[PDB]
Each structure stands twice: as structure tokens, then as C-alpha cells.
Amino acid sequence: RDERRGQLLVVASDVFVDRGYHAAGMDEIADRAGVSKPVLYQHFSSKLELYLAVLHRHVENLVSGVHQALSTTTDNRQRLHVAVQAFFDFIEHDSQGYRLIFENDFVTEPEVAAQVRVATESCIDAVFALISADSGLDPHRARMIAVGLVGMSVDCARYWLDADKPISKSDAVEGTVQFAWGGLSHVP
Amino acid sequence: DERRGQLLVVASDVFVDRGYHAAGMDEIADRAGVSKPVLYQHFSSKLELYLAVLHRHVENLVSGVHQALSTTTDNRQRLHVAVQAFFDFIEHDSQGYRLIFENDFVTEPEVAAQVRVATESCIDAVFALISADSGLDPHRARMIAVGLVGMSVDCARYWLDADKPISKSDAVEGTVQFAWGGLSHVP
DNA sequence: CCCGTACGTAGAACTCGCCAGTA
DNA sequence: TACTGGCGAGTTCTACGTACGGG
Numbered sequence A: 001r002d003e004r005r006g007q008l009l010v011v012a013s014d015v016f017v018d019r020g021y022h023a024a025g026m027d028e029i030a031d032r033a034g035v036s037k038p039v040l041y042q043h044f045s046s047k048l049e050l051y052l053a054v055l056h057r058h059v060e061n062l063v064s065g066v067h068q069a070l071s072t073t074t075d076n077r078q079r080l081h082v083a084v085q086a087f088f089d090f091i092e093h094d095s096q097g098y099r100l101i102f103e104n105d106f107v108t109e110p111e112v113a114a115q116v117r118v119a120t121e122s123c124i125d126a127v128f129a130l131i132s133a134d135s136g137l138d139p140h141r142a143r144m145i146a147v148g149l150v151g152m153s154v155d156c157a158r159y160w161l162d163a164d165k166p167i168s169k170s171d172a173v174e175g176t177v178q179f180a181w182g183g184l185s186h187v188p
Numbered sequence B: 001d002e003r004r005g006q007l008l009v010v011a012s013d014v015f016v017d018r019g020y021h022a023a024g025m026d027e028i029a030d031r032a033g034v035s036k037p038v039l040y041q042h043f044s045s046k047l048e049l050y051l052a053v054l055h056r057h058v059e060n061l062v063s064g065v066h067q068a069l070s071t072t073t074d075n076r077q078r079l080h081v082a083v084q085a086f087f088d089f090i091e092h093d094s095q096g097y098r099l100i101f102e103n104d105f106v107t108e109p110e111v112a113a114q115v116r117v118a119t120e121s122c123i124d125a126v127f128a129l130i131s132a133d134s135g136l137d138p139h140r141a142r143m144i145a146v147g148l149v150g151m152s153v154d155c156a157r158y159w160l161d162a163d164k165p166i167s168k169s170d171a172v173e174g175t176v177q178f179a180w181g182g183l184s185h186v187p
Numbered sequence C: 001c002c003c004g005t006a007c008g009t010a011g012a013a014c015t016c017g018c019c020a021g022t023a
Numbered sequence D: 001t002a003c004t005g006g007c008g009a010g011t012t013c014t015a016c017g018t019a020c021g022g023g
Helices: A004-019 A026-033 A037-043 A047-070 A076-093 A095-102 A110-133 A139-162 A169-182 B004-018 B025-032 B036-042 B046-069 B075-092 B094-101 B109-134 B138-161 B168-181
Strands: none
Touching (some): A004 A026, A004 A047, A047 A110, A095 A139, A110 A139, A139 B168, B004 B025, B004 B094, B025 B036, B046 B075, B046 B094, B046 B109, B075 B094, B075 B109, B109 B138
């Protein structure tokens, strides 16, 4: 065989999203990869190691994109747009990462929760750092506002995706940006 | 009397401490100080017990939010009342916030459906208000309603996981001002 | 008449009797 | 005919859902 490890991680990411962590099985993974379960164990000595490798792959996909987006410009409207774009690009291309982060089913194993937390915190840090440097407010309050902003973006994105993309990505982004800028105050 | 109520409280405790999958009927019976057969006499399945706990918590949150939304037609005020109701929920019934938003049994759609309906009732109420008071068409109004509810829940989870570094009144006012004026009014 | 105990069983993460290609 | 190397056919352990001894 060739490097089956890469194809196994791709298949496992596909399978975990459909079944959930607990329901996914090594029998199902071997079945869909068309490889025997002992060979899979030859590559990954435990189910947890495979899970942490998938989680790490998805977090890095999102985080490098977010950092690169946040380094493009010092114009708050611009860094706002770049970050929201990075978020929508992630949720559209890596559907499995999206499901694994927002529909995580194995919180009972702290290494799992830590990978999720570090991924959520990278987003919070990028928004917070810009707001803190460019606002001078209370440190505690700025992080809370950054978290709210990130959460709002993810929830809008989840609405869009769960509705079978009823509007264009450009429309979803523009709506989110306009809402982030003028808030509820400019809706009526 | 009817031990059922105390059992639901104990089951909520066990699910929050251990998580759904790790929780066991043996542990719930142990902490309630009852035998496992009596627990099965009251709740025929772990899923049924979980759904009963979940339903209790959802009704707890949603009635508080809806009643908040009926107090006044000053949209800024109903924004504050609803967010306050949400923070109030997350502070008293600490176990419920975790059970709804840190849900570990995605494999059983009736669970996910009860969660979806709780989020959607709040979203529907906000959407209905935006549509009547803004002339916004459905897609944009619903997207904004979803954004507002998600933002409030995430702010509350940050605040609670950070051990409440500011007062709820402070937490509430900061959240409302950010929701109202957006980033344009942050510096 | 009824609670605490001790168990059957299901399901799945992990391993062992086959099976194909050489001199 | 024998040696390498990967696969169906067990093993066990864990935890849900019930059948013997006290009050």
C-alpha cells in the first residue's frame, strides 16, 4: 500500500460527521476505507490518537486562515471583513471541520476539549487583540465582546449552511458585516 | 411524596458532571440514594430520562425569554429584557445551560430537535419583531435574529467560564450596547 | 408488601486461524 | 512444500436493563 494514513484521516473526517464520535466505529471506518481493521490499527494504535489528529488538522486549517486574514490590514472595516470571509470560507470548504467544532460529541476526554478550546480561543484572540489595541477599553469586556462577535458569525454561518445556502456567500458576508457595523440600531 | 422531581434534579446533576455517555443509571441511583429498579419504574429509558431533563430546562429558558419579550414594545428594552432573561437562566440553572449547549447525544434526533426548537422559538420571536418594526424581508431579518441569539449565548458562556469577572448588570449592559451599536461604537 | 444485590446481555474496541506467492 | 504478511472470527469489558435476599 501507499501512504494510507492520509486517505484514512480524510475518510474518518467524512465518517465522524455523519455518525458522531460515539456511533462511529472502527468496523465502519474499515468498511468505508475498504481496509481491514488490523491495518487501520497498524497506522493508529488508538481511536483517540486518530481523533486528535483529525481535530488538529481542522483547527490548523481554520487558524492559519484566520491569522493570515488578520494580518492583511489595520483598517477595522477591512480586518472585520477579512476575518468574516475567512470564517465563511472555512465553513463552506471544510464541512467536516465545521461539524467537528460546533457539534463536538466527546467532551469527556479533555485532550478533545482542549483542542476545541484552543481553536475557539485563536479566533477570540484575533478579534480581541484588534479591538483591545484599537479601543483601550476594559480587557475583560473586550474579550467578552470578541467572543460574542465570533459566536454571532458562526451562528449566522450555521443558519446559512443548514438552510441549503438560500442566498449567496457574498450576500451572507455583507449582511454579517453590515450588522457588525451598525448593529440592531440600524435595522428598522 | 413523588420522588420523580428529585430524580430529575439528580439526573441533571449527573449528566452535567459526567456527560451523557459517561453518565450511568447506576451513578444516578447512587446519588439520589435510590435503587436502580425504582429509577427504571419512573423513567423507562435513559433517553426518556434525558429528554425529560432537557425538556424541563428548555421550558425553563423559553418561558422566561418569551415573558421578557411581552413586557414592552420599546425594542431596545425588549433587547435588554431578553438578554437579561438569558443570563438569569444561565446563572440559576447552571446545569441546563451546559446540557443544552454542551450536548453529547447528537445520535438521537429527538434530542437535537428539542434543542433546535428552543433556539428557533427565540429566533422566531426576534425575527417577528424585526419584520414588523423594520420592513426587512425574511432572509435578512432571520439571519440577524440568529446572529443576535448566537452572540448572546456565546457571551454568556464566556462570562460563566471566566468565573463571572463582572456583574450581570455589567455583563448585560456590555452585551446590549455591543448588540445595539456594533463595532462602530467600540473605540 | 417492598428495597438493595447480583446478573444477562449487547455492542464495540482490540487481537488470532487463514491464504497467496516463491523454488 | 515452506515462509511472510495481512484478514474474518473471537475476547473481554463496560454499562444498560432485571431476578434473589431483608423490613
